Each structure stands twice: as C-alpha cells, then as structure tokens.
C-alpha cells in the first residue's frame, strides 16, 4: 500500500520489499533446518524406547495373567 502513497518514492519501497523477502527466506530456512534434524532424531529414539517399555509392560501383564491362570490350574488340581 505504500506504493500508491502520495509522497513516497519507489526506490525505497523496492528496497523494503527486498529486505522483507530476505527476512522471510531466512526465517523459513532457520525453522526448517531446526525442525528436521534434531526433532527427527529425538522423536525416533523416544518412539523406539517407548515401544520397548510398552512391550516390557505388556510382558509383565502377561506374567500376571499367567499367575492368574496358574491359580485356576491349581484349582483344577484339586
């Protein structure tokens, strides 16, 4: 909108457009570079560890269910 302003000059506004463009490129590139590497690595590692821990918890629950079934086995023994 500053282009069609009464007193403004074109060259300064073109410079401001160049500066805005560079700022946009820089911010987008910084956020992308930060988001890709570290976030991907940490997410993958945490996901693997969480899956392993959930498998261990399911194994413990299966052992508890095995004890519950051994209760019925001993009951059948009588």
């Amino acid at each position: 909108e500053q282009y069609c302003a009464p007193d403004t000059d074109i060259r300064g506004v073109d410079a401001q457009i160049k500066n805005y463009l560079d700022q946009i490129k820089m911010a987008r590139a910084k956020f992308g570079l930060e988001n890709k590497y570290s976030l991907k690595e940490r997410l993958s590692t945490l996901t693997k560890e969480l899956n392993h821990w959930r498998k261990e918890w399911d194994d413990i629950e299966m052992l508890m269910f095995g004890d519950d079934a051994h209760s019925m086995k001993k009951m059948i023994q009588k």
Binding site: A27, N35, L39, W53, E56, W57, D59, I60
Partner: protein
C-alpha cells in the same frame, strides 16, 4: 513448504517428543515395579528349580 506450516509442525514435533518422553518414563516405572514384584515371586521358583 510454508513458514507457518513449518512452525506448526515444529511445535507439534516438540510436543510429541515431550509427551512421548513422559509416557515412556511412566511405562518404564510401571514395568519396573511389576518386574520387581514378579522377580520377588519367582525367586522361590528359581531356588526350587
């Protein structure tokens, strides 16, 4: 991709890593407690075997 979507997915990945760490710690504590109880029970079984 666009900067807004970039910031959005970055925040989403951060929150996901945080929640994953929290849930992993919780599940690890639960599995540790259950495995401790199971080992306390199975000590006698191992001694007998």
């Amino acid at each position: 991709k666009g900067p807004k979507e970039l910031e959005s997915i970055n925040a989403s990945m951060k929150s996901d890593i945080e929640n994953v760490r929290q849930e992993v710690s919780s599940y690890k504590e639960k599995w540790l407690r259950d495995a401790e109880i199971f080992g306390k029970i199975t000590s006698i079984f191992k001694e007998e075997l």
